[PDB]
Amino acid sequence: STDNAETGVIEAGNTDTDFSGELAAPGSNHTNVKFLFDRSRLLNVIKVLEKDAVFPRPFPTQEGAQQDDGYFCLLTPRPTVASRPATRFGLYANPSGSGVLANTSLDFNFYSLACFTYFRSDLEVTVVSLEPDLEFAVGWFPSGSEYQASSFVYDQLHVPFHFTGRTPRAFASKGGKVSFVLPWNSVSSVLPVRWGGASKLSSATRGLPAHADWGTIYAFVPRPNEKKSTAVKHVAVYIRYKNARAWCPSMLPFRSYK
Amino acid sequence: FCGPMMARGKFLLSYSPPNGTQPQTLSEAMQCTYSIWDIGLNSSWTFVVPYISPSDYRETRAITNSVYSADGWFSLHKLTKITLPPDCPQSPCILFFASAGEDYTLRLPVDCNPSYVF
Amino acid sequence: RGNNGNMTFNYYANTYQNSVDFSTSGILNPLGYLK
Amino acid sequence: RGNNGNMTFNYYANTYQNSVDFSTSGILNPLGYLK
Amino acid sequence: DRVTTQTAGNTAINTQSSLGVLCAYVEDPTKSDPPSSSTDQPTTTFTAIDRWYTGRLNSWTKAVKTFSFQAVPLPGAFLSRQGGLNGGAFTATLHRHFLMKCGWQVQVQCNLTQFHQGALLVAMVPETTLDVKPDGKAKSLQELNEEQWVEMSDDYRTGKNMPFQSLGTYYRPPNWTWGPNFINPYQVTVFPHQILNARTSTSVDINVPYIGETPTQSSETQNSWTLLVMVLVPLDYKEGATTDPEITFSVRPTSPYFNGLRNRYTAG
Amino acid sequence: DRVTTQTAGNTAINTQSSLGVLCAYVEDPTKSDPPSSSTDQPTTTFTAIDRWYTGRLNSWTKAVKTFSFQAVPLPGAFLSRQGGLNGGAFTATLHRHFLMKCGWQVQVQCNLTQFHQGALLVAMVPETTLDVKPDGKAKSLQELNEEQWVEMSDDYRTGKNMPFQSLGTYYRPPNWTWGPNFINPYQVTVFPHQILNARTSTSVDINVPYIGETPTQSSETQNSWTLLVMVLVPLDYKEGATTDPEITFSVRPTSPYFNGLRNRYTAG
Amino acid sequence: DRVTTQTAGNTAINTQSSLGVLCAYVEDPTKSDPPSSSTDQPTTTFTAIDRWYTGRLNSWTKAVKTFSFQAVPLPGAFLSRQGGLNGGAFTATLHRHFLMKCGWQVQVQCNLTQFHQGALLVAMVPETTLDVKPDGKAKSLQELNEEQWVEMSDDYRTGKNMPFQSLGTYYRPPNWTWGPNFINPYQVTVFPHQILNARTSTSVDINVPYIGETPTQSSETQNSWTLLVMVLVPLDYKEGATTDPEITFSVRPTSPYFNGLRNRYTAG
């Protein structure tokens, strides 16, 4: 039917608008935002700590630095690099060379349907072992907080301070899993799926949000430093969005024709 | 229509449900669901593709070609050639948009295709 | 609601199971209006 | 009913435990009638 | 009808081919309350800043390709005077406050003729970094003038070229393949917009409310809204017709709230 | 007003320069009753035949002279597929019934420009043999394509060339001087019609009811209505303007009644 | 009583030995609503298709063995003209629609004598592929004529010979031992049916409603109902009695709904 798309508004019609027919009855409400994002998906795979760690230093990190890489998981669907917020998402097509291969993550599913600018929800976290008969624990600190390093000595054994604290620590049974829900805890009101600002007035990276996350989790072995092993253990981190809400329509990623 | 305002012309938009062979001729298109669009003051024309299916739901992805995942074709024919006055650009362009009709519904969330990141 | 089929019971209080905004004290609407 | 002896409780809502048709809005009968 | 005159302060903009004003999200994007994140009495609208500010954009030529664009950051353009956009008292107030919250009313002007053809998509896009170069620096007035229009490319469609922090020599430099600030040119009509089609009008109007990840934002760094002008159908005309039609725009800040008064901003 | 969209079945035709629909003889040429001459229950309208069928006519050029014309027999054109006029289920039903009664809604499309000049008379003419050659045979699709437009001549103005029975050798062949099926070009506006003037519209609409010497008629031979397109003012334009504007038409059978169902018609 | 005359359109079939009409599943298999899976106004019954179409089947002889059969696919038989079953306007409409939903009323005619003996089971069978050869191709009119009657065999009783997709050289060809489209000859009376016993009647009538895995189905490929004629007791008679009694059938589509009008179906 006659219209003018230049207006910026085009009404959705049906078979009977210009032709002869009727409306098809509604088949489902699966496009409902709350229902759609309310399901677990893989966020990242991290190594399990077997001693107190040294949190990765800020960028740019110079050669010779002593730190633990691939252990901390930033809870966010946004791109991350080496446990920190990121803008560009990267991977390694040529894993051959010199230098540490930074861990990167991205909620692929989230962005394939994130046709909006802002998002908010509580976060259900599930940690699954990728190792046989593993006994591990999970640690977590809020957005804006940090990992408490070092350790204390009990009976000449070094026990990392990450065994204690005021934040959630979940000890799984041998071969078991860990699961719990966290509240939106960032100081921001909503999470910017895409962002155009800057978190600092000087030497800031445009588009890089400072606290677009639900905090950080890590996994460790309920054993003292001394009883350390040599074989690196891995654990998978799953997240689920509870009571999700979204604002300001936006685009979905470009699909190549090649 | 994004040609000049002095332009005139008519188009025939048609939708054909599945057939053994895809229609090509104006005579064939004209026998399916169609509407004739006249170029003039108003620049646009919306065309609703009726939902004509054997099943109450249809496949979103044509993994295998069937009457449940492929529902025919939409085609645009120029009915009467575009007429322009002297000193007017030739070959006017027609912008195409697609959207869900008011009774459009989606069912069963599936895994995403992560390739947009490669 | 969301992807939740539990009609019956809620063991933990709303303020613990979920976060709620602090106070400062079907029908799908359009996201654009032509005026 | 079916092969179900649970008279008591249903934890999950009917629309989650089962699928239901969307709307378009003892005595065994014969399958054939002679007219 | 198609003839309208919008007044604001000692300002008035007329058009004789209005398509109406596209209001984003709510019927009156002008209704807004003070930010809940600041306890100081804010500075609100006063007549010297309740008006339209007008600036220029680069001309449209036959050579500009489909999906090529120009972007105007808000309030960024006021701060850099892009297109000669001097915000008078608005900028003076902006420079003296840590925080600023406001909406925008914008009109893009570009007259063609009944003998020209082509179409521009004019949209207000939330949270973009289209005004920044991949190296992280904001495009200078000179750089904007040298390029005229930014060509759509794999980098932009991918977000592969958005600003980022270099990792340092400690890390193997990764292959950047995507970014959340990408632009899918085919979906730019999802945003509040109007299309400036040579055959239907010489202007477009959009009215948007304040948005942000927080109740209010840093004056000097926010960029919640960006005026985007993108070619959908290449410009064309016969010899003799006026060439390179110009493009201008008018912007009016609406329901502004300024918080955190201090001495003029000075770069560190 | 001038912008209309006429729906019928899975069909819809739009125009942005309507002059209104010229209804012949009665306010609603669509009202009609079953034929009193057949006792069998008729087949009436069903959705697959309640629609517009569209076909082509030969293009209009500067060379076509005043009063030259093109004719479309109804339902004849459906039977021969003149202009690519395939009547789908309508023709299939027509071929299987001895009798058929119906009216017609027609629209002729031909867009020009504000810089072209010329006028076509579009009329629905009752009881003509304009689709037949003087030798009695119907013009084939090839013959229509070779001539393009039929020139007005003394023969047509006189009816001198209409089909007839040769008398035989027993009689002296007479001088044929006139025929009742003549065409007085100056009076073609007496019929239901509209004029397609380059300066006023790109289409015309006519709506006529069933007519005939009897309540219903033979499907295969009737020709109570003929769509006539005749030049009143020669086409003209300056070098550079689009040449040879095309002409198309849409036809919709209204309130049809079919009687005498049988196997498909087969020529004897 | 036993004498009945069933009228439909310009059609009427009489019998003087009716056993009554066997209605499947519901008291009135004729009641039916439009398909919920199509938003376009359907084409429904019109008088030219509300009638009985009659065709032939191969004659019954003393040589036809127990459980040998003949099958008539519906609407397939209309499409291939099996037995001379030309569906007039029904087929013409069928060929022009993507979808079609309908029920069927059928009568099988076969008169014998009070001196003949033998019995035929006449049933309407849902969802079969009895009209297809094991290689996947539909039996041609010539193939049906060469075999006359299909003999019951291990293949049919097993479904071992139904159409299938060959796996390809990548796979070891398996031993096909069974198929869901098998036929257990002893249980064919489970379907809507009547028995044509030489001693009791010269005809049988069955009336079935629409069925299918979906609200409506593809015109060109559906085969929800198949008319099955199978020998239960071999034909026999003494020398002098009429030999090879003929078999004919009449079919009437009921409450049809056609959706998705388009140009005539053309094989790809």
mmCIF file of C-alpha atoms in Angstrom, chain A residues 1-6 10 12-15 18-19 22-24 26-28 30-31 35-36 39 89 91 106-109 111-112 253-255, chain B residues 1 33-35 41-51 57 97 100-103 105-118:
data_model
loop_
_atom_site.group_PDB
_atom_site.id
_atom_site.type_symbol
_atom_site.label_atom_id
_atom_site.label_comp_id
_atom_site.label_asym_id
_atom_site.label_seq_id
_atom_site.Cartn_x
_atom_site.Cartn_y
_atom_site.Cartn_z
ATOM 1 C CA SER A 1 0.000 0.000 0.000
ATOM 2 C CA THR A 2 0.924 3.652 -0.467
ATOM 3 C CA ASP A 3 3.508 4.944 1.984
ATOM 4 C CA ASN A 4 6.586 7.139 2.475
ATOM 5 C CA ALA A 5 9.486 5.376 4.178
ATOM 6 C CA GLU A 6 11.394 8.685 4.426
ATOM 7 C CA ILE A 10 6.321 2.227 8.431
ATOM 8 C CA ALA A 12 3.386 -3.490 9.807
ATOM 9 C CA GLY A 13 0.576 -4.778 7.606
ATOM 10 C CA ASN A 14 -1.081 -8.127 6.978
ATOM 11 C CA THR A 15 -2.570 -10.142 4.128
ATOM 12 C CA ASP A 18 -3.995 -4.886 0.083
ATOM 13 C CA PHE A 19 -5.159 -8.424 -0.598
ATOM 14 C CA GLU A 22 -6.909 -12.636 7.616
ATOM 15 C CA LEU A 23 -4.325 -12.408 10.394
ATOM 16 C CA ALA A 24 -2.404 -15.499 11.455
ATOM 17 C CA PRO A 26 0.150 -15.740 17.423
ATOM 18 C CA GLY A 27 2.288 -18.867 17.688
ATOM 19 C CA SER A 28 4.642 -17.999 20.540
ATOM 20 C CA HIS A 30 9.871 -16.706 22.402
ATOM 21 C CA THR A 31 11.176 -13.327 21.251
ATOM 22 C CA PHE A 35 12.572 -15.476 28.316
ATOM 23 C CA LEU A 36 15.129 -15.414 25.501
ATOM 24 C CA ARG A 39 19.460 -19.784 29.552
ATOM 25 C CA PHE A 89 37.863 -8.972 20.064
ATOM 26 C CA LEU A 91 42.065 -14.576 18.644
ATOM 27 C CA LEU A 106 32.910 -13.080 24.069
ATOM 28 C CA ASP A 107 29.326 -14.213 24.575
ATOM 29 C CA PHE A 108 28.842 -15.143 20.903
ATOM 30 C CA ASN A 109 25.165 -15.900 21.371
ATOM 31 C CA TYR A 111 25.901 -10.449 20.517
ATOM 32 C CA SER A 112 24.187 -12.366 17.729
ATOM 33 C CA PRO A 253 26.652 -8.121 13.608
ATOM 34 C CA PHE A 254 27.372 -7.938 9.890
ATOM 35 C CA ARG A 255 27.123 -11.270 8.059
ATOM 36 C CA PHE B 1 11.530 4.956 -5.350
ATOM 37 C CA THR B 33 -0.471 -12.693 -5.725
ATOM 38 C CA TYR B 34 0.462 -9.275 -7.041
ATOM 39 C CA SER B 35 -0.048 -5.548 -6.873
ATOM 40 C CA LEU B 41 3.714 11.882 -5.074
ATOM 41 C CA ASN B 42 4.132 9.138 -2.463
ATOM 42 C CA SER B 43 7.519 7.449 -2.672
ATOM 43 C CA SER B 44 6.912 4.031 -1.170
ATOM 44 C CA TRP B 45 4.922 0.854 -1.476
ATOM 45 C CA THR B 46 4.586 -1.908 1.091
ATOM 46 C CA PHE B 47 3.967 -5.450 -0.074
ATOM 47 C CA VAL B 48 2.909 -8.080 2.413
ATOM 48 C CA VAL B 49 3.910 -11.613 1.496
ATOM 49 C CA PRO B 50 0.920 -13.695 2.632
ATOM 50 C CA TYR B 51 1.665 -16.665 4.866
ATOM 51 C CA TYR B 57 4.841 -23.008 11.306
ATOM 52 C CA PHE B 97 13.451 -3.120 2.875
ATOM 53 C CA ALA B 100 8.074 -8.679 9.984
ATOM 54 C CA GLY B 101 4.378 -8.159 9.251
ATOM 55 C CA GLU B 102 2.034 -7.534 12.184
ATOM 56 C CA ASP B 103 1.122 -11.214 12.589
ATOM 57 C CA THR B 105 5.937 -14.728 15.110
ATOM 58 C CA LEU B 106 9.137 -16.689 15.870
ATOM 59 C CA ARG B 107 9.401 -19.970 17.760
ATOM 60 C CA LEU B 108 12.125 -22.148 19.342
ATOM 61 C CA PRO B 109 15.414 -20.394 20.192
ATOM 62 C CA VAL B 110 18.356 -22.132 18.486
ATOM 63 C CA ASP B 111 22.146 -21.935 18.762
ATOM 64 C CA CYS B 112 23.698 -18.910 17.094
ATOM 65 C CA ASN B 113 26.146 -18.946 14.207
ATOM 66 C CA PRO B 114 29.351 -17.413 15.695
ATOM 67 C CA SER B 115 31.056 -16.930 12.322
ATOM 68 C CA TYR B 116 30.513 -13.139 12.395
ATOM 69 C CA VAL B 117 33.621 -13.048 14.557
ATOM 70 C CA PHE B 118 35.834 -14.851 12.021
#
